Amino acid sequence: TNAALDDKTIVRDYFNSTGFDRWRRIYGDGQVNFVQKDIRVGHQQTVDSVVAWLVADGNLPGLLVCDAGCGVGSLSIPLAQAGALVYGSDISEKMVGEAQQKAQEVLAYGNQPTFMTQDLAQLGGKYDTVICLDVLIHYPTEEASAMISHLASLADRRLILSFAPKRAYQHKEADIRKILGDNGFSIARTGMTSTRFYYSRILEAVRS
Ligand SMILES: C[S@@+](CC[C@H](N)C(=O)[O-])C[C@H]1O[C@@H](n2cnc3c(N)ncnc32)[C@H](O)[C@@H]1O
């Protein structure tokens, strides 16, 4: 018997249990405390900023996009609404199930994202753009490095990441940029969401 479950299992079990209930609420509608409300608003800003980047490029309709660690589809759904071909995945079956429910309710039989329960490190195939928002916060830098390298291998052109700049882990921007550089990516656009209880640094990386 192990002294500890691996980080992925701990995170997965959390988002399949009480984490599902708490984050479905934060990412959804209904009463929240002022801390949770701040997180809801901040996270919405991060999502909206990324959608805005992709819309601004003019090539979003028909674009193949991987949304790794998609949660309840907060990013996947608006990208699909804008015409992207979205492939969302999450390690938590509960989060994935909710994403599909929310998608079916608002998109019906139109351009829906495709949702799969899977560890992002096990994803295959190739995409124009790979996106991983507010997921790396759950892993130490060493593991985050391996995750970024795997995501990079799926990205033909672009990788977009967000992280808390230096349970929960902060990452040094210098470290994240180094890992991206090691994988053959240069930094293009960047962003930053800063509220009272929510901090998310956003990097757009493009294959050079
Ligand atoms: C804070 S939520 C962010 C969700 C989504 N990216 C968003 O911004 O709306 C973190 C999500 O990452 C997922 N996650 C954590 N580790 C993962 C992994 N190794 N592979 C895929 N998803 C993972 C969790 O299940 C959780 O749904």
Ligand 1 geometric centre to CA of 111 (Å): 22
Give the start-to-end residue ranges of the domains of the chain. 1-208
What amino acid is encoded at 15 in this protein? F
Q: In this structure, what token pair is assigned to residue 192?
A: 């930053």
Whole-angstrom Cα distance, residue 87 to residue 130? 9
Q: What was the structure determination method?
A: X-ray
Contact 142, 169 (CB under 8 A): no
SS3 assignment, position 88: strand
- Which H or E run includes 156? strand 155-163
Pairing of strands 114-117, 85-90: parallel
DSSP 112: P
Cα 201 to Cα 16: distance, rounded to the nearest angstrom: 26
Give the count of beta carbons closer than 10 Å to the beta carbon of residue 10: 13
Report the alpha-carbon distance of residue 170 to residue 185 in Å, rounded.
21
Residue nearest atom 19 in ligand 1 by C-alpha distance: 119
- Phi, psi dihedral angles at 62 (to 5 degrees): 90, -5
- Given resolution (angstroms): 1.6
Distance 57 CA to ligand 1 centre (A): 26
CATH 1.10.287.540 fits 1-208, yes or no: no
| Residues 119 and 146 sit within 8 Å (Cβ to Cβ) | no
Residue 58: Cβ-neighbour burial (10 angstroms; 0-12, 13-18, 19+)? exposed
Rounded to a whole number of angstroms, the CA Rg of the chain reads 16
Could you tell me where the beta strands, DSSP code E, fall in the chain? 64-68, 85-90, 114-117, 127-132, 155-163, 185-194, 199-207
Q: Which residue is associated with the tokens 């956003």?
A: 202
